[PDB]
From a paper:
All Fab fragments bound the VLPs with one Fab fragment per E2 molecule. For the VLP-CHK-152 and VLP-m10 Fab complexes, for which no crystal structures of the corresponding Fab fragments had been determined, both the CHK-9 and m242 Fab crystal structures were tested to determine which Fab yielded the better fit to the cryoEM map of the complex. VLP-CHK-152 and VLP-m10 Fab cryoEM maps were best fitted with the Fab structures of CHK-9 and of m242, respectively. The footprint of CHK-152, however, spanned both domains B and A as well as the linker peptides to domain B represented by domain D. Thus, unlike the other Fabs, CHK-152 has the capacity to cross-link domain B with domain A. Alphaviruses become fusogenic at low pH when domain B, held in place by the flexible β-ribbons of domain D, becomes mobile and exposes the fusion loop on domain II of E1.
The E1 glycoprotein participates in cell fusion, whereas the E2 glycoprotein binds to cellular receptors and initiates clathrin-dependent endocytosis.
Numbering used by the authors:
A (entry chain A): 1 to 217
B (entry chain B): 501 to 717
Amino acid sequence: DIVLTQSPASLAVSLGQRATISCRASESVDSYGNSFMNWYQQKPGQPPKLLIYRASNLESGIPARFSGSGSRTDFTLTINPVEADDVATYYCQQSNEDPFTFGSGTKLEIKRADAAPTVSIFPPSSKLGTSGGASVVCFLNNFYPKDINVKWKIDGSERQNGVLNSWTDQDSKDSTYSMSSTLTLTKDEYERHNSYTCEATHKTSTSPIVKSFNRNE
Amino acid sequence: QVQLQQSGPELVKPGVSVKISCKASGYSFTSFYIYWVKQRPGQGLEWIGWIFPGSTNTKYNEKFKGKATLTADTSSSTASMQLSSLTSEDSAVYFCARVDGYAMDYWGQGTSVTVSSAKTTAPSVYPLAPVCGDTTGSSVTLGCLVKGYFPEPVTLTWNSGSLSSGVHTFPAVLQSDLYTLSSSVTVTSSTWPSQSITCNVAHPASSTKVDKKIEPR
């Protein structure tokens, strides 16, 4: 009912620097005398955690580095300095009237030194062959930034059918990303070809990291 | 110690109502408001309605009025929400929150409801040992493949939870009405295979607790 918009939608801030988050309102929530604007921190898989209520007053247990301000419709939350465990989507909510509404979302991400992924290729297990399946797994662990492309090659030729990808959220300590790719194939298709290469291009190096295995062993 | 304990995950067919419980402990149940919040996967937060455990007093969001009903039992100190005839746009994470005017102080874990009209399928656990060949050295990675299951979630554990520091758990991605999820653990070469590293996989719907030891191929 009362629209709350957050700017920007996503911000990148280096460790130890200042981050500014805005929350615009369609109606003045500060009515009657005091501001009824709350702030929340939500890490993936976890419920939102209340940081600051009424724009100014912080909740007990929350560090003083989390600071909020604003009145009427324009409200701002700042974190100074930022830490590795600040990776979360931050929300502003309003009380006042009439059905309670949350903000819009603003994802916080940390900029750090560029890291190269440690690539590890895994052949299908012996129990996969008995079931009739064949999944070749490839893990890309601890790298920055998030932008990465994985290309599967079977016997020198690229394969894009049956590729399953999943990206992790930023680490609460390392502030790094991780990705896993799997070739969902059948036993009939697996035994016909020999070489399987996992290839990944990144900003850290022009040469792609190629990890491969042969079925012949 | 104020706590809110919500129920487990839920799989429902379209056109079936469901009750979601929220157990409260550590405070006087009848003296505080309890708000309920909906979260569409990969989206923002939605306020559903509040309930006062003292007596029958509720106010709902106009978008949820004819769908959500709130009840509270004083003797068991549990807040319960019923959601009538669930659709595709109802598959979300529902939260219960303790509110002391006018901010949500304490939260539950959140119940993940999925609809979803597919059959519940058993997960298949596959151990991922390093590429064939008697070791490589330095620091080797181990993996665990969970292929073809329904529905969410799957709780992944390594050695009952002792070696849970260098673990990368990947979010599940749906393919052809089936979920797939992987986990990788990176350990030093000195502690493998001298120390036995096991993969603990648990699934609620199929009621399966498959434990698999990763042994060199």
